[PDB]
């Protein structure tokens, strides 16, 4: 792949093999010479088939087990792409056994290798996409609840509301902390960490903004308009941040 890989895990699995395909490209096809014999690939190529067979095994269980719908539609084509790519590798080994200098077979090696890595890439991005959708779900849930601070006019409720939004924040903070460590783009990690930090420190402020309101909302005096404008401003500010976080999570090259 030309663009940097989306995450550290994907980079770890593909980057190295992608380099090899490049070396093989430079070597044989699209490079200096290529016909000087090619040992028997039957052994290793059989190993890929097995591996591929297992990957498709695991992936299919994943399909009939996940609740995500997109994952259910997106993963299956990857099995095929991979399975079909594997077919070319087997046909290539075969040809090579008949002729070590066969170029269409060499073309098949590169083609079959690319299909497997590409199809394995789609499988990991699909899976990754499904994971980010879990984080977003959490974020939108916090968004939905933040829109509830609007009511709350009693210390009792304010304490309840607090008892609920607290763990939400803690949960969103962990996911984004760990997801951030996986990004392969500096700027994206940075943007996320800042948004999350800005949100972590606005929590105590939202709670104070709320305590302020409930109090004045229970005191026959006090200028309620002010408390309102500010509590709302704090919610408007926490929301924008969280949407920024949602936006950044879906950023891909």
């Amino acid at each position: 792949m030309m663009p940097v890989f989306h995450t550290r895990t994907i980079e770890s699995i593909l980057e190295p093999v992608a380099q090899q395909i490049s070396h093989l490209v430079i070597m044989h096809e699209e490079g200096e010479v290529d016909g000087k014999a090619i040992p028997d690939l039957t052994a290793p190529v059989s190993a890929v088939q097995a591996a591929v067979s297992n990957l498709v095994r695991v992936g299919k269980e994943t399909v009939q087990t996940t609740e995500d719908q997109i994952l259910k539609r997106d993963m299956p084509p990857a099995f095929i792409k991979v399975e079909n790519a594997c077919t070319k590798l087997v046909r290539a080994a075969q040809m090579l056994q008949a002729d070590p200098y066969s170029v269409p077979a060499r073309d098949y090696l590169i083609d079959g290798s690319r299909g497997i890595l590409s199809g394995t890439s789609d499988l990991l991005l699909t899976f990754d996409e499904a994971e980010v959708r879990k984080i977003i779900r959490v974020c939108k849930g916090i968004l939905e609840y933040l829109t509830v601070a609007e009511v709350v006019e009693t210390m009792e409720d304010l304490v309840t509301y607090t008892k609920n939004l607290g763990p939400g924040m803690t949960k969103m903070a962990k996911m984004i902390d760990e997801r951030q460590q996986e990004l392969t783009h500096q700027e994206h990690r940075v943007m996320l960490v800042n948004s999350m930090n800005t949100v972590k420190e606005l929590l105590p402020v939202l709670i104070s903004a709320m305590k302020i309101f409930v109090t004045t909302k229970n005191t026959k005096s006090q200028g309620i308009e002010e408390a309102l404008k500010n509590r709302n401003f704090t919610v408007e500010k926490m929301s924008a941040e969280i949407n920024e976080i949602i936006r950044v999570l879906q950023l891909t090259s």
């Binding site: 190295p16 093989l24 690939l41 290793p44 890929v48 097995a50 297992n54 990957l55 695991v58 090696l109």
Partner: peptide, 24 residues
């Protein structure tokens, strides 16, 4: 799980081994 990610790593390492035989 991480089972999916592990089997994806094998296919990769098994393919790598294939290119390694091509001295690539």
């Amino acid at each position: 799980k991480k089972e999916l990610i592990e089997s994806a790593r094998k296919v990769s390492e098994k393919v790598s081994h294939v290119l390694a035989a091509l001295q690539a």
